[PDB]
Design a protein around this nucleic acid. Sequence first.
RNA 1: GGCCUGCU
RNA 2: AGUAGAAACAAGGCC
Lengths: 717, 716, 247
Amino acid sequence: MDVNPTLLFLKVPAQNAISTTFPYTGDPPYSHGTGTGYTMDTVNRTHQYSEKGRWTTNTETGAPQLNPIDGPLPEDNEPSGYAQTDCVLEAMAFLEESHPGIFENSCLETMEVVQQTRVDKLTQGRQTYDWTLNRNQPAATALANTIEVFRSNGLTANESGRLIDFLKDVMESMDKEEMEITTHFQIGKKKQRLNKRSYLIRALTLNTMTKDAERGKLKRRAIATPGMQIRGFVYFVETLARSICEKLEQSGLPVGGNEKKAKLANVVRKMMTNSQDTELSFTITGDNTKWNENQNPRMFLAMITYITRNQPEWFRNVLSIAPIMFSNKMARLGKGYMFESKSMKLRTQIPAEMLASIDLKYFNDSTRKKIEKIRPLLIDGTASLSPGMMMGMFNMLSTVLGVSILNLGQKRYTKTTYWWDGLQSSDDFALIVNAPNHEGIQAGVDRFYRTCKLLGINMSKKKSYINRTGTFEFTSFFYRYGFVANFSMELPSFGVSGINESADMSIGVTVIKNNMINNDLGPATAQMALQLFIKDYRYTYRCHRGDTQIQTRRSFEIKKLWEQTRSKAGLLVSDGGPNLYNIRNLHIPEVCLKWELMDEDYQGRLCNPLNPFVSMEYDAVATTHSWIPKRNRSILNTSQRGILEDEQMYQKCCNLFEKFFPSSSYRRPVGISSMVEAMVSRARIDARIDFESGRIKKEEFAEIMKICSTIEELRRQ
Amino acid sequence: MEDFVRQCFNPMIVELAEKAMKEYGEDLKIETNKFAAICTHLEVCFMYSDFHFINERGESIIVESGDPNALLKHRFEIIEGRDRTMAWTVVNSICNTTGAEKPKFLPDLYDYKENRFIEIGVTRREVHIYYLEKANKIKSEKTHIHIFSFTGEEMATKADYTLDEESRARIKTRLFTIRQEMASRGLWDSFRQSERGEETIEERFEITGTMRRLADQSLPPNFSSLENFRAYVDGFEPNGYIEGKLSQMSKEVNARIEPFLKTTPRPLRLPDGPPCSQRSKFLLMDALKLSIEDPSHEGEGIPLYDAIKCMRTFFGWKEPNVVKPHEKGINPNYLLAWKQVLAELQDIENEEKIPKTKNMKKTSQLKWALGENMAPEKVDFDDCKDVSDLKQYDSDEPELRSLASWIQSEFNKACELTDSSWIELDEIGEDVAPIEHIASMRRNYFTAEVSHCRATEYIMKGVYINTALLNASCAAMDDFQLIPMISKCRTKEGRRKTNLYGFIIKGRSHLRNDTDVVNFVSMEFSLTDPRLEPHKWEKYCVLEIGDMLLRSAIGQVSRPMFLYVRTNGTSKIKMKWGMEMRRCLLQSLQQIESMIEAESSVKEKDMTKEFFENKSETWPIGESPKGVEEGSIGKVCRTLLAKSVFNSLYASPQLEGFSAESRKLLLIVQALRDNLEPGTFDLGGLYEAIEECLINDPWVLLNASWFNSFLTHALR
Amino acid sequence: MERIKELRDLMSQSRTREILTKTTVDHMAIIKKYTSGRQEKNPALRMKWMMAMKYPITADKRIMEMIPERNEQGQTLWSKTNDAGSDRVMVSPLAVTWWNRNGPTTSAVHYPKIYKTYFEKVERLKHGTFGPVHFRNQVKIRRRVDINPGHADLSAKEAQDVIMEVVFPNEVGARILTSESQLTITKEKKEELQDCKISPLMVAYMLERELVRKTRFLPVAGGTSSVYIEVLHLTQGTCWEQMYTPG
RNA sequence: GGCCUGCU
RNA sequence: AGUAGAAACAAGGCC
C-alpha cells in the first residue's frame, strides 16, 4: 500500500475534509531582506494597468502623475484602471435609489462623529510613518512628534483638543514656506529646515515594507503605512464608509465571521430556493485580481462628492481631503539593497534614496529593468503612486463600490430575464446569478464582468469558478448546503500567546472555549488541545507540576513552594500546581477555579496588591503572575537614545497628574489648560473645601496655597 | 481692531479670552466682537469678585485692595473662565460640599456665605429682555442672576443686588467708559448688531492655498477645478451612461464560461531535474536508538548522563571511516568532529559531576562545519564601489529537482505502528459531565490508536530538538554546545525506556531577526547503507562507526552501523514552530472527530466505539498496484497525523502556494463529482499557478503526485 | 500637601517644567502612550525566546528591598539593571515564585468582591445539575445574544456615567443622571461602597464588569438565557446536546 | 584584548 | 560549506 491522504477525498467530500488541505502546522513564509523590489514592482505594475491615461506634472510636488479616469475602454481581459466617472456616479445614484436616504443619514452620523472627535483618537493605532524621523513609530509617538513640531513652528490650533483642529493645523502647515524639524546625531540636536516642497513630499509619502507570516502565497507582498497628516482624514472617511456599509445588506466587511456566514446563508436562501422550477441558479466564487492597483483615489473622491451632496461645505471639504492626498501620495521605496562581493568577501548596504543615482551595474536583469522603468517617477527618494491605492486604507469604500455593482443587478436595472445578487468583501465575493437558461446565466455573468471593468474592478479568472448554487466559498468559509467547520485556520492560536502566565492561561482556555462554540471544536479535540496547551505552558514558563523531577532554572523554588503548601490542588499551574481545567471549566478563570483550595498563606502572597510585579477578550484575575516582560533594549546603541529619558519624564508627570486627578486613568482627561495649571487649580479648590469642612486646617491650608502661588510664579517665569 | 482690545483690557483678561475662544475652535481674526464680549464678561466677573474678602464669619470686608493677610477668604469663587473640565470640577466639588443644587449650566461665580451660584451677563440691549432670556434658559433656578448693560443699567432677581452699591457703580462706570471709547472709534455700531450672531458658532473647515491646488489636480481629466467637479456631481442625473459604454465596449471583454468535464482536467506537470534530497532536520525512518531502560520521566534526567549511559550499553565501536562523502565539503572535518565528540563524552564521564550543559572546544573542524567567519565583512558603499565582483545578492528561482521515490516510502513508514508509546499527555480536571466522559472515551481511543506511531515519535523528536536548540541559542550565543538527541518511550510491557538518536553541535546563535540562521552539526546513528539511495544523502557525510548484532533466526546478522553527519541550519521562527509540532495531533484527531460526529448525527447515538472496535467502515487511504486500498478509522487517523507531521517538518512557501492553488482545483473537481455543472473562466491560469510552486521540495512534489493520482482515480 | 510639594519639585527642573507648562490636558493621554517600545507582532516567539534568558520579566524597584538578591541555593532573583525606558528593574521568574512562598501576606477577603462575577460563575457551575446527553442533529442558528450574566441593562456610556458618579463624584462633569433607574443604582452601589479601601480604579472596573451589558453574535441552539449562553461550549455541539441546569 | 545589544 | 529562496543569514556597532 502506497499511502495517499488525497484519496480520502474519494469518499469524504472536499468541504467535509477541507482542514486536511491547510498546512497550518508549519512555519509560515517570512521575508528575509529588503522590500524595495516588491515596492518597485507594485509601482511599475499599477502604472502599467493605467499607462493609457493622461500624464501630468504636479505643480506642488513637481512629480509625474497618471490619470486613467475616463480613459479608453479596455479591449482585453487584462487588469484595467480606466474607471469611468459617469459609470461610478450612476452606480452611486442607483445605490441611493434602492436605499433612499442612506447617504444623508450616514452623512449625519459622520458629521456628529467629526464634530465630537478628539485628537487622542489618533493614538489608537499601530506603526505609523513619523515624517519627523522618516521612520515607523507607534501611533502615539508619531502623534506627539507631529504635535511638538507644529507647536514649535507656530501651528497650535491642536491645543483645542479636537481632531478637526489638528486637521486644520495639518492643512495650514501645507502653506508654510518652510518648516523646521529636529535631528539627532551620534549626543545633541540639530535644527533642519525643509522647504514647502520637501514638507509636501514628506507629508504625502507612505512608508513601504514587506508582509510576513502570509499563508497561502508563494511570493512575498509589499504593504504600506501612512503618515500622521492623512490619518485623521482617513479616520473620518472610514467612519462615513462604515456607516454606509452597516446599512447595506450586501456588505460583509464591517461584521464578524458568524455574521458573514449568516449573510451568505440568507442570500443563498433568498436566491436559490425562491427561484422557480424553470429558473437556473449558479454561484461564482470570485476573487478580484490586483484589487488595490486598480482603485484610483480620484474615483473615491467622486464617490465622496456624490455621497456628501446637499451637505455643509465644511463637511464636504474635510471628507474630500483624504482622497485628494491619496491621489498625490508618494511611496517610499524601502530599506534599499544589499550587495555582495565574493572575491573580496564583503557586503554593502545602499539605501533606496540612491536608486535614482546608483549605477545599474550591480543589479540583476529584473531589478535593472524595475529601476529603469521606475526612475522617471522617483522624486526625492520616493516614487509617485497616483494611479491607484497601495494597500487597503479604504476597504470600506471599496466594499461600498462592490456592493453598488452587486446592487446594479436587481432586475430593475438589468431589464432582462437574468439577475444577480450575493455578498462582497474587499477583494473577495460570492455572486449568485439566476436566469431561465444557461444562455441567460452566461449573459448575466458577462454583463456583471463588463460592468465591473467599467468601474476599475477586475475579476480574477484564474482564482474564480462558477458552479450550481448550493456549494461555494467565501473568505475561506466553505459553504456546502450549510457552512462547514475549518479548524485548521484556528490551529495557530492554540499555543501560549506570549503575554504572561495568567494572560496566557486565560487566553488559551478562552480560545479553546470559543472554538468549541463557533468553529465546532469537538469535546475530545478540546480536551487534547487543553492537555497540549498545558504541556507547552509548563515547558515555556518552566512551571512543572512540582511533583515531577524535571530540573529547570525555576524548579527549586517550585519544589519548595510545593512542599510548603498543604493543599497542593490550589496552586496555580504557573506555581507547579495540578490542572483542574475541563470542558465545564473553560469559562472560569484559574484563580477563581482554585480559590477555595488555596492555602491562606499562598492565597495572600499570590493575590497581594503590594506585589512589585503587576503594573480576543479574556477574563483575568490580577496576580503576581501578571508581570510585564522586559523590553527590546536595543535603543542604547542608536542616535534615538534620548527617547527613553523623555518617556520616563512623561510617565512621572502623568503619574503625578493622576495623583491630582483620580479619574485620569479611567477616562482620559479633557481640557485646554496646561497640566501644571490644572493641577494647581485642583489643589487650590481641594485645599479650600478641605479647610472649610475637612481634614485640612488653617495653617497647612495657607502653606498649601503658598506652595501653589510659588508654583504658578515659577510657571509664568 | 485687536490693538484696541489688547490696549484697553488687561493682558490677563485677553489671554483668558483667547483661551476660551480657542477652546471651542473660534478665531479672534474672524470673530472679533465675540473676543471683545468675552473680554468684557471676564473683566466684569473678576471685578465683581475682586477686592471683596469675606471676614471670619458671615459678612464681608470691602477691602481697599488685595492685602497680605491671614484672611485668605473670598466672598465669591470665580467659576467663569477657568476651563470646561476645571469649571465643572469646581462646581461639582462645592455642590457636594455645601449641598447646593447643581446648576444645569455653568454659572459665573459662587457666593459662599449665602451658598448660592451667581450668573453675570453684559447686554447691549435693555437689561430686562436679556434677564428674562436667561431666566427661560435657566430653570430650576435657585441661582442669583445679575445683569448689566453696556449703557450701564442693572437688574437682578428679587431686585436683589448681592454686591454693594459702590462696587457695582465702579463696574457700571468701567462698562460706560468702554462703551463710549469704543464708540469714539465707532465699533459700537458693530457691537450693537453682533450679539445675537455671537452666541452660535459656524464651523469653517475651508480648503485654501496648497491643499486647494492639489484639490484641482485630483479630478477626472476633463475637469479644471474642484468647484466645477462638485457642481457637475451635484447636477448629475443618471441617464443610462453604463448601458451606452457597455454597448461601446469591445465584445472581447467577456467572462465566457468553459465547461469543466471529466476529460477536461490535466495531470499536474512536475519539475524535471536531479532527484530531490532529504532536507529534514533529523533522520526519520533511518534513525537508530540506543536504549538504557531508565525509569525516569520525560524531563527527569540530565541529557548528557543519559547519552553516556546509552552509548555505554552498545559495544562494537570501530575506528570511524568515511563511507559516503559529502561531495561538496570536507569529510575529514566531519570524521574529526565525531572523534572530538567521543573524546569530550569520555572527558565528561571521567569527571565527578555530569555538567547539565557541555560546551565544545572551538576547533578548526567545528569552526568550518558550523560556519564561523563565513559572513562577509560589512562595509560602507563608499569604500567598495570599483570592485568588479560587487553585485546584488543572488536572487533567482530555486534549482529544479525531480521527485524521488524515497519520500513516498518515508511517508509510508511514518504511518505504521510501533511497539512503543510516544505520548503521555498532561492531566485534566476530573470528568463530571456525561459529555466529558464521552470526550474522554473518544480521546482514549484516539491516543490508543495514535501513540504507537512513527509520526508521534517524529513529533517528540522535533519538539525536544527544537526546544533544546532554542534554549541553547538563547543561553549561549557564543559557545559550541553538545546536545544529545533524547526521547523517552513506554514499552508495551509498561517499562520506561530512554533513546539516543545522536548529537547536535550548536554554534554561535546571535539571532537578531526571526529569519537569522543558527548553524549546527547533526550526527545520527543508523543502519541504512548510504550506497543504496545516494541521491537522498546529498548533504550528508556518512561514516561507518560500528557493528550491531540484532536478534535474528539466521544466527546473528552482524550488520554495520553508520553515522550520518551533516551541517544544517535553523531559525527562531523555525525552532519556535518545531517546538509546537503537537498541533498535528490536534489537526488529525479534530478531523477524525468531525467525521465521527457527522456520522453520529444521522445515527442517533455516538459511534466512536463502533468505528474503533467493530472496524466496520473503511476509507480510501492509498493505492496498491492492483488498485485503491481502503483502511479502517485507525489507519485514517495515522495517515492524517503523518500528513500534518510532514507538513510541519517540510514547511515551505511552495507548500502553502500549492495547497491553496490545488484546493481551488480540488473543489472544482468535487463540484463536478456532485453534478453541479461546474465552469471555469481560465483553467490554464490556475494550472500555471499550481505548477509554479512545484520546484524542489520533496513534500510538495509528493503532494502534487498524490493530486495527480487523485485526479486519475476520481473523474470516472 | 504631599502632592503639591512633588509638583513643585517636578516644576523645579527645566525639562519637566517645560513638559508640564507646554503639555495641555487634552494631550495628557498622548504623552502617556509616548514610548519607544513597539508592540510585538509575534508575542509567542519572543516569550519562548525571552523565557530562556536570565531576568526576562520586569518589576518595580521596590523589589530590591522586598526580595533578597539570591535565594537559599544562590540563584539570582533580581538585577539592578533598569528597563529600557522605565525605572523598573529586570528580574527573573524565581522572584515571582519566591514571592509566592516567602513574600508578604495580606488578607484576600476583598478579591471575592473584586471579581464577584467570576466567583458567581464558579458557584453557579458548582451547584449545577447535569443530565443525559442527547445525540441528534443540532439546528444551530446564529443570533445576537447577551453574554454578560449580571447585566443591569445599561449601555457602555450610560453605565460609565454611574461608574463615575459612584467612584469619582467630583469628576462627573456636567452629566446628571436623568433616569431614575440609574439614580437608584447609584444610591444602592454608593450605599454598599461607603467604606471599601480598594483603590478607585479597581472599583470602576468592578462596576463596569458588573453593570455594562455585552452582546455577541454566536450560533445558538435553544437556551438563549444569559446564564445558558455562559456554558454554551458545554451544552451544545455539532451532534450532541447536554442538558444542564445552571445553579 | 575586555565591556554594550538581539523587534528600534 | 550550510540554512534558505526573488533577499537574506552565516553576528552588529563604539573605542
